């Protein structure tokens, strides 16, 4: 099963129980970005993240009363039209806001049973993506997939390092292919535990397929109310890239020397092949608009690799 | 039977018959459709060679000026770009896109690919999440119907085509449309089958290979390149690769009689094998812009993908 989480007085984490630690509720959003929930029917701002205020440029209790609808009337049913009840917690709908107090936001929506879950983070507003894509394609084996992918990420990036991480059978990782800068240490050809992703963190990367910590020392922002009004239970958050990222996780990035760190899931045959994975070794913000250009990447890694090992076995 | 290629009409090769058919060589057509402009230059000295004869009118230069200059003089920010990203012996399949502010002609999309020794150029006019809401409904389809119809109607709201269908290839080669979004008024072709002929199985074979192809005007004249064979080789230039490439005066034919003034499919490849088209159809002439059919093409792959998903959940 799971622990229940810290702020509902569940146990502490440690490597005796990496399996048990409940990643997909902590309560808490990194803060480069804000985080609504509201209800699916009524459009009424059930939950705000104490942040709210600066990135909505909003009184704080004007929110947790005010409804959708009220709040961003164009938006509101395009959402309800996209996010269908009973759709999967998979599916989202993204927007661009020019919204008066930021410039322009990007809004990112899913649903998850009652709930809506709104994200919001800045945003902004060319040929690489698809010059990319016919690289992938031509690549003759999956050795050279491999290298076209992990340079092709960093030069659209400028991540310090990328890398893609293959399981094995058992779950151990293996670093089969790197792009780096010139002075970091190289992880090429080195494998790891299968404890370092566990078990509960694997089964979320099969179904939502990117994550990222912006900064490893930056604090989390709770939620307020933390429960869900709804159920007097806590929010679901394992579809939001704003999640507040696991401490322990936290704590292994740090003492790696990064700064912020991102992955894309590679799956195949419906199992999590692997993992495209970014550092920098500074705090580092990637934008939405070049986050959805990996989130492309990732399917076409997933198909690719397919095509490719097909023609060895 | 399948029978190798005739010579192309201007080698001395037969006019084409419903008789042989699968022996036309649609790949060497010696000519472009004319809302673009074609090049190919050498490989190795970007020397240019050929060129459409519409060139001085997109590229706004005489053709001997042209012809008189390398590619390093005409292209001097694009010419390092190209041979790093299309180096000697990479497949024909593999494309350099960018983006060109030339003075006479506004913004120009240079598509470029390698065939051998020989660079083809290809010149183009050119011009918010829709691909991303498109890419998470594509993948919550609950099966293979309904994600027919989710890409069949987002592809229809992304171009604004008349009719947009799921041809589904069975293993004889015959056709079936099985999803479609269509204008009012159109009659349906949902569930109707169609025979193999219908696209000859060398067509078949080069829509695995290059996965999009069009017709921008079912009536206009093809523009010939000149001169119409390769100096390099005195053989024809190869422009399977080329969305510019002139279309078959056979299906062209086949559209007109239909009705249709534009045409474009994009193939859906699972196994290595081509599992059946987005083909699209517009009653006027229309030309869908290169960032907008770039749109197309990724939709084309994340089906590929899906439909791979939606038929292992079937047995
Ligand atoms: C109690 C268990 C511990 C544990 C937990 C844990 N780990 C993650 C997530 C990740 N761990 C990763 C491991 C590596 N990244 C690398 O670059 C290398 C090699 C150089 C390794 C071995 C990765 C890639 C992830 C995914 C996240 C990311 O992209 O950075 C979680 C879940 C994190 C979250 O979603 O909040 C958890 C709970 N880690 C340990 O080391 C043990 C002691
Ligand atoms: C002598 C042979 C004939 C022949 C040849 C032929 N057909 C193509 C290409 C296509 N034919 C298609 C057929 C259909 N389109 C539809 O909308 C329907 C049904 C509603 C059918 C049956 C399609 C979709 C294509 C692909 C191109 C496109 O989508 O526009 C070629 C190749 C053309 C080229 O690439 O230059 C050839 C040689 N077609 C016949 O009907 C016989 C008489």
């Not at 990194?30 to 939950?47: C, I, K, R, Y």
């Not at 107090?101 to 009652?114: P, Y």
């Not at 989390?220 to 939001?240: F, I, R």
């Amino acid at each position: 099963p799971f622990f229940p989480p810290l702020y509902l007085g569940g146990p502490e984490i440690t490597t005796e129980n990496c399996e048990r630690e409940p990643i997909h509720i902590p309560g808490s959003i990194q803060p480069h970005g804000a985080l609504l929930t509201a209800d699916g029917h009524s459009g009424e701002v059930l939950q705000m993240s104490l942040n709210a205020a600066t990135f909505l440029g909003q009184e704080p209790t004007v929110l947790r009363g005010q409804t959708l609808a009220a709040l961003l009337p164009e938006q509101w049913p395009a959402l309800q039209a996209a996010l269908p009840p009973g759709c999967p917690d998979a599916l989202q709908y993204r927007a661009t806001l020019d919204w008066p107090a930021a410039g322009h936001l990007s809004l990112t929506v899913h649903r998850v049973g009652e709930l809506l879950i709104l994200e919001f983070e800045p945003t902004e507003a060319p040929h690489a993506l698809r010059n990319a894509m016919f690289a992938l394609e031509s690549a003759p084996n999956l050795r050279a997939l491999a290298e076209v992918a992990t340079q092709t990420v960093r030069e659209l990036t400028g991540f310090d390092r990328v890398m893609l991480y293959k399981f094995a059978p058992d779950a151990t990782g293996e670093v089969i292919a790197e792009a780096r800068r010139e002075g970091l240490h190289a992880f090429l050809g080195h494998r790891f535990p299968a404890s370092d992703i566990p078990a509960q963190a694997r089964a979320l990367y099969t179904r939502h397929l990117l994550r990222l910590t912006a900064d490893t020392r930056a604090a989390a922002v709770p939620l307020d109310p933390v429960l869900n009004p709804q159920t007097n239970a806590p929010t679901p958050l394992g579809g939001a890239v704003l999640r507040a990222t696991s401490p322990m996780h936290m704590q292994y990035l740090r003492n790696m020397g990064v700064g912020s760190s991102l992955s894309v899931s590679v799956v195949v045959g419906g199992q999590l092949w692997g993992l495209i994975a970014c550092h920098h070794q500074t705090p580092y913000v990637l934008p939405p608009d070049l986050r959805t250009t990996l989130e492309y990447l990732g399917r076409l890694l997933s198909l690719q690799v397919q095509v490719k090992e097909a023609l060895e076995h």
